Amino acid sequence: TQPALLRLSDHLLANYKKGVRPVRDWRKPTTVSIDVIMYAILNVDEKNQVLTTYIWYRQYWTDEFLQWTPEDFDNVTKLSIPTDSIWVPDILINEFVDVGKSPNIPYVYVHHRGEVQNYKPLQLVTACSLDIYNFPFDVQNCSLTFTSWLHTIQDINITLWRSPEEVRSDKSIFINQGEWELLEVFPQFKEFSIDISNSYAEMKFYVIIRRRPLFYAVSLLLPSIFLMVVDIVGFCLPPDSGERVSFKITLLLGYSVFLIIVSDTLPATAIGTPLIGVYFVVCMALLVISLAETIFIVRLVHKQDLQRPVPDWLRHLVLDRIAWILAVRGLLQELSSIRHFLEKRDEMREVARDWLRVGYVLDRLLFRIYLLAVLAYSITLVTLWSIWHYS
Amino acid sequence: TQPALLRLSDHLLANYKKGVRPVRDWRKPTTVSIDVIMYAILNVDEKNQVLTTYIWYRQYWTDEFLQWTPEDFDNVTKLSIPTDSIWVPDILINEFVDVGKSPNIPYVYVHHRGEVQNYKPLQLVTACSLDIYNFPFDVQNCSLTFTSWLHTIQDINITLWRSPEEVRSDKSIFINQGEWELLEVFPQFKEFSIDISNSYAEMKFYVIIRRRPLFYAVSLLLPSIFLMVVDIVGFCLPPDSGERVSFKITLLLGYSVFLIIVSDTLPATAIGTPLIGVYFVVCMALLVISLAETIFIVRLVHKQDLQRPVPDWLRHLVLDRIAWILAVRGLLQELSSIRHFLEKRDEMREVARDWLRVGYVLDRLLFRIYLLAVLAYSITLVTLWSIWHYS
Amino acid sequence: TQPALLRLSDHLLANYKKGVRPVRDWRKPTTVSIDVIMYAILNVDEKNQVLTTYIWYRQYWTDEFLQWTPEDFDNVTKLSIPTDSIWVPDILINEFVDVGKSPNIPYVYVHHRGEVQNYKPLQLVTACSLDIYNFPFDVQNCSLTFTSWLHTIQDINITLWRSPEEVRSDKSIFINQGEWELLEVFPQFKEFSIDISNSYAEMKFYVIIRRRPLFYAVSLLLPSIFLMVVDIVGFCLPPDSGERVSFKITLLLGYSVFLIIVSDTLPATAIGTPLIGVYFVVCMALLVISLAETIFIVRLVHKQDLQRPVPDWLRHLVLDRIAWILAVRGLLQELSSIRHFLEKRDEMREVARDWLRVGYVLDRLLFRIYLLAVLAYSITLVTLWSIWHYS
Amino acid sequence: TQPALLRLSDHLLANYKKGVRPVRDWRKPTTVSIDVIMYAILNVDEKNQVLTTYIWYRQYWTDEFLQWTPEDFDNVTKLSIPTDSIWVPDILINEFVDVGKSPNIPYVYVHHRGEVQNYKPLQLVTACSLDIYNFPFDVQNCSLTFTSWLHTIQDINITLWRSPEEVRSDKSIFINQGEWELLEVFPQFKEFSIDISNSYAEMKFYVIIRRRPLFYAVSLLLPSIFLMVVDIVGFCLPPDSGERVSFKITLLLGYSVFLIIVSDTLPATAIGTPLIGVYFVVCMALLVISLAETIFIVRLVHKQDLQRPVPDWLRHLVLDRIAWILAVRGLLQELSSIRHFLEKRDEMREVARDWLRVGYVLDRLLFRIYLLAVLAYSITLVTLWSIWHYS
Amino acid sequence: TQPALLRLSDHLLANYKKGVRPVRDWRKPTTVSIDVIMYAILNVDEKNQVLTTYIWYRQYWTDEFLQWTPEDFDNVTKLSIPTDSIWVPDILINEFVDVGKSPNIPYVYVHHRGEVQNYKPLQLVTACSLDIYNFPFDVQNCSLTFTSWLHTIQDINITLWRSPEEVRSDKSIFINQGEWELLEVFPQFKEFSIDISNSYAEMKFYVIIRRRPLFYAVSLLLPSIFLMVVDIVGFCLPPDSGERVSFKITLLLGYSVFLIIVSDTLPATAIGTPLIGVYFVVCMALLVISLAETIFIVRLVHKQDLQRPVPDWLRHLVLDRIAWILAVRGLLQELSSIRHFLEKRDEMREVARDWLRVGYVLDRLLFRIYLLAVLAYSITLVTLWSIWHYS
Ligand SMILES: *[C@@H]1O[C@H](CO)[C@@H](O)[C@H](O)[C@H]1NC(C)=O
Ligand SMILES: *[C@@H]1O[C@H](CO)[C@@H](O)[C@H](O)[C@H]1NC(C)=O
Ligand SMILES: NCCc1c[nH]c2ccc(O)cc12
Ligand SMILES: NCCc1c[nH]c2ccc(O)cc12
Numbered sequence A, B, C, D, E: 001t002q003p004a005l006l007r008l009s010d011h012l013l014a015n016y017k018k019g020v021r022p023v024r025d026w027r028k029p030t031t032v033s034i035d036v037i038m039y040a041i042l043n044v045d046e047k048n049q050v051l052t053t054y055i056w057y058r059q060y061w062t063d064e065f066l067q068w069t070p071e072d073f074d075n076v077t078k079l080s081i082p083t084d085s086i087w088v089p090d091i092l093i094n095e096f097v098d099v100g101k102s103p104n105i106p107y108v109y110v111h112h113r114g115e116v117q118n119y120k121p122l123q124l125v126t127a128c129s130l131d132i133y134n135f136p137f138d139v140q141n142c143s144l145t146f147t148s149w150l151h152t153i154q155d156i157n158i159t160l161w162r163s164p165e166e167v168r169s170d171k172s173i174f175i176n177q178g179e180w181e182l183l184e185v186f187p188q189f190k191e192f193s194i195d196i197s198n199s200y201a202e203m204k205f206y207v208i209i210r211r212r213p214l215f216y217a218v219s220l221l222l223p224s225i226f227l228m229v230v231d232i233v234g235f236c237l238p239p240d241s242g243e244r245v246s247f248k249i250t251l252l253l254g255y256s257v258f259l260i261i262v263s264d265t266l267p268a269t270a271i272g273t274p275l276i277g278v279y280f281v282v283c284m285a286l287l288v289i290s291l292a293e294t295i296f297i298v299r300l301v302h303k304q305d306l307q308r309p310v311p312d313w314l315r316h317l318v319l320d321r322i323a324w325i326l327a328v329r330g331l332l333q334e335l336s337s338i339r340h341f342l343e344k345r346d347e348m349r350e351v352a353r354d355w356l357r358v359g360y361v362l363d364r365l366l367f368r369i370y371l372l373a374v375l376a377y378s379i380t381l382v383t384l385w386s387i388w389h390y391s
């Protein structure tokens, strides 16, 4: 005799005639109130300048045709109806690279005063400009805007639903333990117009995210200090031996191949030039000047075809030493000849020994200077890190 | 005269009016009982913190409108009808990264008392937090939650169908011989609420999986012990020869390039720091101190420009040896000069020989110390492995 | 006056009422006869344990509602109707990783006795367990099962259509000139049941495929024999020269980097351990012991700081040689001193020469032993290959 | 009593009969006016000769059946109706590689005079010919054409809507800070015909884009000048030492491996041959001739088995030096023999010294020539860069 | 009073009853005439034996139910109707790996005599057998076949539309400046039958394409001749120096790593063995025998522990030289002893000098032989290239 609640379900859907903007008067617009909450931040692609995010989105508006009195229908205040049977605004998002992949959820709440609500999850892979000038300590500011693609300001009006301060500070759900953590989501309403007599409404959410670089800092600092330490420990071997230049060029080749294979992996971009490359270039130049010093010292010490050092050089190298911290005539003729030969050989040996001593002293002094330079570089780096840590 | 069973098929579907929650009274909610069984575990992505699983899922609920007496229709108790002609709850899964790919199966059983059942396979690629602190011996605890996205607690209520102990211990179907094997699937019912006056029901299944690391253990241990053995066998060659430093730096370069090309392949993450990296750093430091010892020994042995060793040094190096386990005057003038030259050369040779002996003794002692250190490291590693094996 | 054949097309489709299992009596089940033929085998993924295949599939069953007399309708025995207007069983395939990509073909033959047939191509990417213990000479046994996901044994019954011996030996269409060639497709009917009072029917096809490894065999054998030959030819150079150890360590580094870059490319898995790795480890160990022999020989030959060899050593090294295949007193005082110095130098030279001869003899003997070992290894490898070739 | 605006919504859609080209007379064609605006330029693939772009596209035409008087319906001039209920032309784009991914936007404006408009975003990945002859300073000219695939010139006519000069200079929306920046979008109308009696209309937009190569220029110039500088600094070490050839071959191997790993990454194509490869080949040849010079100098200086240099050679090498910037008889018999031996040794030493001096002079001269050549190459390169900068 | 042309649009579509093969008599089949034109050739995958092509395809057939007199309907001869409202044959393509991605174009021309035409673009990624025996100069012959999947020969008959000679030579549209250029498209009609009493019609188009290898030829020839030239220039340095073997092994390692990293990139297959690998193996063997010659020459020249060369060897090495292009007794006793020591040293020096001269002569002769062999190889290669160029 008396059917179930469905007695009203057809009563609203008998002659609804969807596909038309539901208003009693066409002059007034329909107002849509939206709300977004972040759930997780998926990977960000610096090469393609595109990021992937996942949000829970909700909206509501007024139908003005789905109105009924609760008392007439068993106290019924709200119900759920399929979303394909009612008018739905076309609220899209700009700077999108694909339609995306998301479920349908073909249901919507409808209240007794015409208010209709829509809840949905949605994943966006979207293009924003990424700046990686300070690559490890990045703070990215990307934007996503909601707007009606075709309806103008006289048709659809965008409202923020919740208060902006509630939206800005909302960490109710967020997947931590990832590469990124968000700082805030700042909303802003704007009016967009390319030409005259045609304007639209947009709502832009600016997402601010910060990277945690501890893994990146370790992976970028450990090989560098490793090669610096091995260069320092390999500096202290005799220079006249021919293995010094081989050791230095082998270490330089190792640094070169490491730098090349890490040249584009970490700064995966085609525009930005982070300061990490500048520090790497500085380290490379330090290795180059160390190799040049080693080559010069090796060239200075070479026993064959030598000349006695010019007095002034020895006189100031001893000065900077204050701051480092019968027919018997043929018989005697032959003996005189062999003696003179031995004196010549001894003189060559003494000249070689003096040149070797000069090379040793110069090598020690230049090693001390290089150690001081490395100390200065390391202390100024840790000083800048402390300045970052304490603003 | 009398049609087939389809005489009831239209009788239930003549004026069903799908799209409305089927209840006689709107106050009571509709209860959905669900059940999941794992079938296989596909790949897990540590870089993206996402895994892929395949389950068989079933659910059932009560329609309260598809009711009939069996006796009236040729003893018919249950039938199958297309799933697009009846109301279906929107039971979704959170922490999902895509809609996924699964067939439709447009059929459902319906019993004579209104009970309706739904069976379906489904593959989920979903985001959970992976911890790889102990990378080879991982035990991952990931979660997947079933909930109604839009209907509240007053509309849909979630029930576990089978008993929790049956669900927890269920290995009826599972594809073994993979990288992972599951331990348990723990179910838990919860009530979810972000704001007030709006609450939902969720059912969370915690999947616990364990990795079998034998392949990983072999692939990570074989090159390490290979390079340790080759370092040990290359340690025992004469130090005064110049090939020792070249051999050591070549082996160090090999270890460096292997470590760099395996630096991110196995610990494919940007947060976690497994202890395998710590052991690799320890091995690298051991190689570095071995190279430093070789360089020091090479520097100590250098025949040119030497001085006699200070007595105390020789006196304690012989002490630690207890624990290692007429005008004929011009003629004689020339002969005296050449004799003195030969004495000078012999003295230099003797000094070089003494320094070489000192270097040999020190090299042998330091080799013994290094061998003892390697023995200690290897035995403590196998000891820790045994402690893991026997708790 | 008299329409075309379509006069019967509506006669069967006027009140068909699809979506219901077409039977006059609900007690008897509907029987579906299926048939599959392979067309080509696409790539197989050993890392993901998944393969891709392409088959032509056909099935037929009885409708019992699409029945007519041919004589009444211009001799018409069979026709074609859209597949969306008739009942279609939900015959799915387990161990599938995706819904796949295949066309629709919205047409089916229907005969005058109710028999209805369905033809379709379908590509499956499906998960099976791959064993690569003998990686080049693989014979893979994978399975694919057809079953009704939701209908039970009382509803749908599976039949093989053609005889099993015809299905097993069917090479009518197959794309050869690929990486794999199939041996047989063995069908087997089974009854599946997880719980009680609920059983289903499945038809499992076991596909057996064999790999042709000639390209793999060449690519795996050529570099190995290349490095063996270059090691053999580099073995025969003087040992006292310092380039021998450099040559050996360079070749060892080359083998190491080749093995590492081919460590996971060919055995692309995380479980299996093929014997090719065992042979590679054996070759590596052979190279290691060759390097150790070279280092020992180099250490044995070192002219500086030598002692005369102990008699017994020389006495058995000559034994194993049988099987390799006035004031004139100051003047004479100075002359005696210089003569004694020359005797000392000559004695050191003779000791060095004797030690060099000992090192040469030992190096030749160990080279012969190493060559014999390489010969033994190569002959036993070709012997095992012949045993494989002739069972 | 009086319904809403929907009173006209059915009035236009009661018997619209979509699917037919809406014209009162079939002889006249329907005219579609289109407009495109670039929004961003995504990645370009030089290997596949395909690019990805994102545009906002709009079009309008005349329906001639959706006509009404505003006064009759509450002043209503325009409305919005679903796009699936009206006739829509099939305006496609050639040289497309996929259907693409874009939303639907199922709404269109309709004016009271039958004018209907359609707005949509669309992303195209499309194939055009890329020329990279001057790879860093590229100016690409690609094309995209809009045409009706099936309707001929007698049915659909294409019009540009806005004036061509407005379309050509339109930077209202464009995502800068990318790899590319566009110069202009030139439109052109054309008539297309493959066979006779069948012609179509097309509208081709030529997009002109320019690359900003600063990152590419830095990444391509820094390693090159690095290796040039290290070659120059390693040139200045003594030639008789055996480490010079090792240093040169190590640097050549480094250049070779860098060139090979960058051989196809930057010029990612299979047709074009940019001039950067020509400059790299020139640098390689310079390194090769430097290595050949080093080998020749090393061969010239070799102390063992020497002959006195032919006079003419010394006489012109001193010429080019002007531009570089009793029974006592046995006793004396033995003394004469040993003296003659010492003279022979001294003569060999003097010959070796003279050859070493010759080698040193030649090495210095060739080093000066090589430095001059490097200076010439660097100055002509910077000169060509300046010519590019100032046309 | 009199409606538009749509007066006939319903007249054909009032009771069309699609889904049935439109014929007045079921005995005669329906004939479909097809035509294909290539537009561009996308990438070809040699690893997966699959290619991607893009064609414009058209077909037409006879409906026999869409017939009208033009005079009755305002001279109307042809119109356009949606393709979903009429019967469409299921003409598919075999050897396809996916459904593909193509637009719909829901429109078809219909003429007044029942002739209906369909135009569509379509991209196929399809599997054909690729032979790369002569990898740079490939001429691939792949096939694509059009057939009705389910309708037999008694239902659908395939016709070529245009004449075969017109189809074979058709370059009206084709995107040049790619990796491939097509030679011809040969059509062929065939009858296909697996079993008896069941036959179908197929139309196979054989596409013939040729590769342009200039980029491949340059990229494969430049490093090879580079390493040959550097080997030749490094051959000419003194053999007794220890850097020769290091240079040779370094160059061999460079060739090895280049060959390995290019081992599978260019011949990206698992079956074919191109002749380029044979030439690379020949070059490797040439480098190996050069290294063996260098090692033998180095072994022959070793000053320590030498014996005088056997006369015959010197006598034929001078022969092949024709074709290369009182108590004073103790005093004299000591002098005699030292003189004898000096004679012994001089004899050893002379023996070493003679052995060095022998080694130099042999090295020069073998260098000449190696140069002649390289000349022969290069000339026969350019000769074979000329034979290819002039058939
Ligand atoms: C781009 O190419 C088209 C095709 O030839 C040409 O008409 C047009 O002038 C070109 N534009 C520029 C800026 O070179
Ligand atoms: C291509 O292959 C088919 C199949 O055998 C053959 O009939 C045809 O002649 C071939 N075409 C050419 C140009 O070789
Ligand atoms: N199942 C989660 C329901 C839910 C609660 N709050 C929400 C906010 C937005 C949204 O899309 C969904 C929700
Ligand atoms: N064909 C397997 C039917 C089946 C048996 N038990 C199940 C449990 C869940 C499910 O989705 C399906 C099933």
Ligand SMILES: NCCc1c[nH]c2ccc(O)cc12
Pocket (backbone or CB within 6 Å): C037, C056, C057, C058, C119, C120, C121, E147, E148, E149, E150, E194, E200
């Ligand atoms: N066009 C191929 C028709 C055909 C013949 N035999 C078949 C077997 C199975 C199938 O799906 C299709 C077929």
Ligand SMILES: NCCc1c[nH]c2ccc(O)cc12
Pocket (backbone or CB within 6 Å): A147, A148, A149, A150, A194, A200, D037, D056, D057, D058, D119, D120, D121
């Ligand atoms: N929401 C942006 C609406 C808009 C303004 N101008 C446009 C031009 C083209 C287009 O597709 C869209 C638009």
Ligand SMILES: NCCc1c[nH]c2ccc(O)cc12
Pocket (backbone or CB within 6 Å): D147, D148, D149, D150, D194, D200, E037, E056, E057, E058, E119, E120, E121
């Ligand atoms: N817009 C191109 C129309 C066109 C002309 N000739 C064709 C041939 C085939 C085809 O699919 C299409 C066409």
